[PDB]
Amino acid sequence: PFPWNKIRLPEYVIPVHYDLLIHANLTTLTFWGTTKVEITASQPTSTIILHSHHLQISRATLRKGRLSEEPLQVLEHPRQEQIALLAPEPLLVGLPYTVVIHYAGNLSETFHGFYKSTYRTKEGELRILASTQFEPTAARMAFPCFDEPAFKASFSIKIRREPRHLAISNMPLVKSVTVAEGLIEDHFDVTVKMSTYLVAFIISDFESVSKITKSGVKVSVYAVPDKINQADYALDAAVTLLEFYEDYFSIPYPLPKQDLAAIPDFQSGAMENWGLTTYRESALLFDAEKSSASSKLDITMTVAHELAHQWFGNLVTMEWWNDLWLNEGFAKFMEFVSVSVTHPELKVGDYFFGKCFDAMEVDALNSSDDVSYDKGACILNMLREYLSADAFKSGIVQYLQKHSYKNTKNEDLWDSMASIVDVKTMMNTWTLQRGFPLITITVRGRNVHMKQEHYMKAPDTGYLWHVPLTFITSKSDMVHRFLLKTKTDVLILPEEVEWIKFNVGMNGYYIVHYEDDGWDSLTGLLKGTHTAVSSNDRASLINNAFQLVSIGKLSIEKALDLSLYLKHETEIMPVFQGLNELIPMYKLMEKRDMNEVETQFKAFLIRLLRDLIDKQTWTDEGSVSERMLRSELLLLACVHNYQPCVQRAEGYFRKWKESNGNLSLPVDVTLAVFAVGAQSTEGWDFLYSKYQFSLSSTEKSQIEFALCRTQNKEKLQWLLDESFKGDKIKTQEFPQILTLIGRNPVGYPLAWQFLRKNWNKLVQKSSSIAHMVMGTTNQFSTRTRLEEVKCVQQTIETIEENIGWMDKNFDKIRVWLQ
Numbered sequence: 154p155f156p157w158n159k160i161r162l163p164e165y166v167i168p169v170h171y172d173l174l175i176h177a178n179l180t181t182l183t184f185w186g187t188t189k190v191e192i193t194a195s196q197p198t199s200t201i202i203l204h205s206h207h208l209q210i211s212r213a214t215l216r217k218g219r220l221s222e223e224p225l226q227v228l229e230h231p232r233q234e235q236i237a238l239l240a241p242e243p244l245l246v247g248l249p250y251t252v253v254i255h256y257a258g259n260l261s262e263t264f265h266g267f268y269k270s271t272y273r274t275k276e277g278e279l280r281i282l283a284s285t286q287f288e289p290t291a292a293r294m295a296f297p298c299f300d301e302p303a304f305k306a307s308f309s310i311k312i313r314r315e316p317r318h319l320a321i322s323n324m325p326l327v328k329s330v331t332v333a334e335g336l337i338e339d340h341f342d343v344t345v346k347m348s349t350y351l352v353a354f355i356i357s358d359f360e361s362v363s364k365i366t367k368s369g370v371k372v373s374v375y376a377v378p379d380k381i382n383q384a385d386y387a388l389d390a391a392v393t394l395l396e397f398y399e400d401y402f403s404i405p406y407p408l409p410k411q412d413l414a415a416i417p418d419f420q421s422g423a424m425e426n427w428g429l430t431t432y433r434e435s436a437l438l439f440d441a442e443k444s445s446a447s448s449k450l451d452i453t454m455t456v457a458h459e460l461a462h463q464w465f466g467n468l469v470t471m472e473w474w475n476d477l478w479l480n481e482g483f484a485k486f487m488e489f490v491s492v493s494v495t496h497p498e499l500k501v502g503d504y505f506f507g508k509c510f511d512a513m514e515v516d517a518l519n520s521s522d523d524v525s526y527d528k529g530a531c532i533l534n535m536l537r538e539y540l541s542a543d544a545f546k547s548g549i550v551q552y553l554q555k556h557s558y559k560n561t562k563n564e565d566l567w568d569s570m571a572s573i574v575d576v577k578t579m580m581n582t583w584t585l586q587r588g589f590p591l592i593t594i595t596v597r598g599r600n601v602h603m604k605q606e607h608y609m610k611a612p613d614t615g616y617l618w619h620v621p622l623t624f625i626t627s628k629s630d631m632v633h634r635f636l637l638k639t640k641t642d643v644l645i646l647p648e649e650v651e652w653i654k655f656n657v658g659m660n661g662y663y664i665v666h667y668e669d670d671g672w673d674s675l676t677g678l679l680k681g682t683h684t685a686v687s688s689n690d691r692a693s694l695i696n697n698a699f700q701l702v703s704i705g706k707l708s709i710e711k712a713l714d715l716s717l718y719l720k721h722e723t724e725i726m727p728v729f730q731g732l733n734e735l736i737p738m739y740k741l742m743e744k745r746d747m748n749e750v751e752t753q754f755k756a757f758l759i760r761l762l763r764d765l766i767d768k769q770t771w772t773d774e775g776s777v778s779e780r781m782l783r784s785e786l787l788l789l790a791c792v793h794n795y796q797p798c799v800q801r802a803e804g805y806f807r808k809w810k811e812s813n814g815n816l817s818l819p820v821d822v823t824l825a826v827f828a829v830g831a832q833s834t835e836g837w838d839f840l841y842s843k844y845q846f847s848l849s850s851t852e853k854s855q856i857e858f859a860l861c862r863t864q865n866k867e868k869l870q871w872l873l874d875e876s877f878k879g880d881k882i883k884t885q886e887f888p889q890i891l892t893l894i895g896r897n898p899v900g901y902p903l904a905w906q907f908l909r910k911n912w913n914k915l916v917q918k919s920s921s922i923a924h925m926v927m928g929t930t931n932q933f934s935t936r937t938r939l940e941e942v943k944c945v946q947q948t949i950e951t952i953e954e955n956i957g958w959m960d961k962n963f964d965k966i967r968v969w970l971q
């Protein structure tokens with residue numbers, strides 16, 4: 154008869170200090186433990202409820218003292234993942250007791266809790282390690298505890314191990330003691346007050362490289378012995394970032410050391426474990442044969458994210474999981490603030506707003522986690538730019554200092570910052586409400602009118618925000634603020650302006666629309682002097698215009714006249730906005746009869762980017778986003794028979810066919826070159842042969858693309874059947890080829906006519922196949938093309954939209970083009 158019926162633990166029995174002894178066998182894959190918890194009762198009681206999961210409790214007793222011990226009855230409630238310890242007599246309030254529990258268990262084979270993980274040496278031998286992953290609720294798998302983040306305590310952790318291994322944990326190793334023949338007991342120092350999910354220990358045979366920060370904090374990277382030489386980058390990144398955070402938060406790194414460990418088969422793939430963060434090997438290790446340029450960038454931000462938690466989230470952790478979004482939101486946001494300073498060469502800035510746009514697009518739906526954590530960061534950025542960067546900085550410092558080693562709620566962050574503007578009430582409009590507002594700007598003389606409304610793709614919501622508006626003016630030279638608390642508000646300028654732009658820097662989590670013809674002046678501004686506003690300002694314009702176009706508040710030509718400025722753009726962010734909203738348009742024309750508009754449109758696009766495309770070096774140099782633009786520009790140009798790039802491309806492909814595939818080819822350009830090369834029936838075949846010795850590389854996927862891009866319909870249809878056969882390739886690729894051909898202007902009918910025919914035997918191999926049903930019909934725009942198609946319930950909608958868009962815009966695009 155279990156004495157507790159709540160998922161949450163009783164609040165009247167409180168842990169103070171854990172003494173953990175874990176003895177794990179990395180051969181038999183089992184572990185025994187003796188954990189002792191010092192507790193205090195605030196109310197009299199003879200039952201102690203706590204957390205346990207998949208642990209066989211051998212023995213539990215209660216100690217007090219001058220010493221006295223007594224057995225505890227043990228009841229399990231596996232559903233709730235809880236135990237109950239029954240005492241003979243009630244506990245004396247305020248008096249310190251100690252619970253001693255003996256238990257045993259099998260190392261997790263599920264990559265959570267205290268789990269087994271493996272790797273193979275270059276010699277090919279298989280090694281075992283034991284590792285931890287507790288967030289959110291897995292500590293109870295390694296040892297019994299009060300497994301809620303509010304129950305903080307100190308931890309004395311002891312690991313028994315073989316001499317061929319080494320244990321690392323949260324705190325530094327104090328002493329190693331030979332305990333028996335093949336047994337050593339590692340004692341690590343007592344932790345500071347922390348939550349269970351942040352406790353961690355690793356048993357393995359890793360190497361390490363170590364550097365010492367300016368403040369004397371020892372930073373080390375542990376990795377598999379064969380790969381330890383790839384930690385040099387992460388280690389340096391860790392050191393400089395730790396130093397950054399110590400300055401920013403104006404609070405010294407709380408712990409004696411910081412250990413970053415690269416874990417085989419890690420599935421998180423990063424964790425904020427206090428003093429011992431863990432990562433997937435690709436997020437920490439770097440080879441001169443890198444997975445990509447993105448990896449360096451990838452690992453420089455994954456680190457920065459986990460290191461930021463050392464302060465925000467560990468030193469001051471949430472009270473409960475409902476605030477996890479703030480923990481994660483802040484770490485994401487901090488990825489940028491830190492790196493932008495620390496590693497400017499990486500150009501992290503671009504990728505931030507991308508995720509903000511991504512978040513918004515999803516919030517704009519009827520329905521409304523990593524993206525929710527992206528909104529958190531976006532929100533924070535908004536707030537940080539409203540209040541000065543320093544007001545923000547100090548407010549955070551105060552938050553950390555006031556709540557160090559304790560727990561927190563959302564309001565606590567707001568309260569702390571609001572004490573340096575009713576931040577709390579404002580922020581809750583953004584936190585307790587799904588979606589974001591569309592903001593319409595109406596000007597009447599010096600009278601500037603603002604209005605807000607819940608922006609969503611029937612339309613009837615009463616949502617209302619406290620929005621931190623910002624704006625610049627053809628006259629002003631400085632950025633203005635205005636707090637929009639109501640449905641509408643006015644604002645009076647000292648004099649009439651030639652143009653006004655809101656959401657400066659694109660730092661705010663909202664889209665703005667200009668009434669009358671503010672767009673006219675803005676697109677007039679961009680075509681005259683586009684540098685008059687920031688790069689991101691230009692990007693937000695392009696982005697908002699084409700969104701407003703898709704909801705019927707802006708006319709397609711107004712947003713196209715806008716893009717005309719792009720002929721002069723040099724910055725990545727805007728160009729990608731342009732491309733992201735323009736391309737899809739002709740991909741709907743491609744799957745339609747009318748070829749004249751399709752061709753004039755493509756002609757228009759290449760005349761816009763002409764200059765930019767020419768400036769492209771045909772190398773692999775530059776930052777991740779610089780390389781992504783080079784890659785996409787060239788591919789585009791050659792796909793649209795822009796002669797200059799097509800010619801060059803042909804040349805390169807010839808030098809590489811007669812190579813044969815021997816001389817190296819820059820990955821940025823290979824996508825275009827292969828594409829061009831696959832156009833000849835002999836080049837297509839060469840690629841297909843070279844397609845096997847592709848080395849399971851990135852190169853394979855590049856060819857796979859080029860092959861599907863040929864205009865030879867027989868060679869396309871051919872790829873279709875063969876990737877369905879067992880002999881040449883089967884399940885691992887067909888789904889992706891089908892969609893790739895479904896996007897070829899001359900190959901879409903085949904993939905459609907194929908999904909229909911072979912449908913029966915096709916379904917024969919239903920959650921990952923939805924990709925194939927979208928990628929085959931996603932871009933139809935005809936009413937009749939619908940009569941045909943009549944899980945993938947979404948694909949039916951998206952076409953409906955494609956048609957509306959066409960019935961409205963096609964006639965405007967046609968006239969525009971002339």
Ligand SMILES: *[C@@H]1O[C@H](CO)[C@@H](O[C@@H]2O[C@H](CO)[C@@H](O[C@@H]3O[C@H](CO[C@H]4O[C@H](CO)[C@@H](O)[C@H](O)[C@@H]4O)[C@@H](O)[C@H](O[C@H]4O[C@H](CO)[C@@H](O)[C@H](O)[C@@H]4O)[C@@H]3O)[C@H](O)[C@H]2NC(C)=O)[C@H](O)[C@H]1NC(C)=O
Pocket residue numbers: 176177178179180181313314315334335336
């Ligand atoms: C996880 O669990 C394993 C068992 O599953 C523990 O492994 C045992 O560890 C002990 C201590 O390291 C090993 O003991 C050694 O046995 C030797 C004789 O071999 C016996 O066992 C082997 C292997 O099965 C048989 O082939 C052989 O026929 C025998 O039956 C002894 O010679 C060793 O002597 C040691 O003790 C003497 C006396 O004090 C000393 O003088 C020696 O110098 C030396 O210290 C030793 O007793 C035992 O063999 C291991 N098992 C196996 C199967 O090999 C792991 O220790 C444990 N590890 C962890 C990290 O938890």
Ligand SMILES: CC(C)C[C@H](NC(=O)[C@@H](O)[C@H](N)Cc1ccccc1)C(=O)O
Pocket residue numbers: 288289421422423424425454455456458459462481484488
């Ligand atoms: C966004 C990245 C830079 C960092 C990210 N990692 C994190 O956010 C970590 O701090 C998280 N601790 C990862 C996590 C969250 C929830 C449950 C288990 C593990 C990751 O992708 O691994």
Ligand SMILES: *C1O[C@H](CO)[C@@H](O)[C@H](O)[C@H]1NC(C)=O
Pocket residue numbers: 815816817
């Ligand atoms: C051809 O080039 C490859 C490197 O791409 C090289 O490893 C190989 O040895 C070369 N073949 C020669 C030089 O005969």
Ligand SMILES: *[C@@H]1O[C@H](CO)[C@@H](O)[C@H](O)[C@H]1NC(C)=O
Pocket residue numbers: 209257258259
């Ligand atoms: C570990 O698993 C085995 C079965 O593979 C089981 O018999 C054994 O009792 C388990 N050990 C525990 C639950 O402590």
Ligand SMILES: [Zn+2]
Pocket residue numbers: 425458459462480481484
């Ligand atoms: Zn995190």
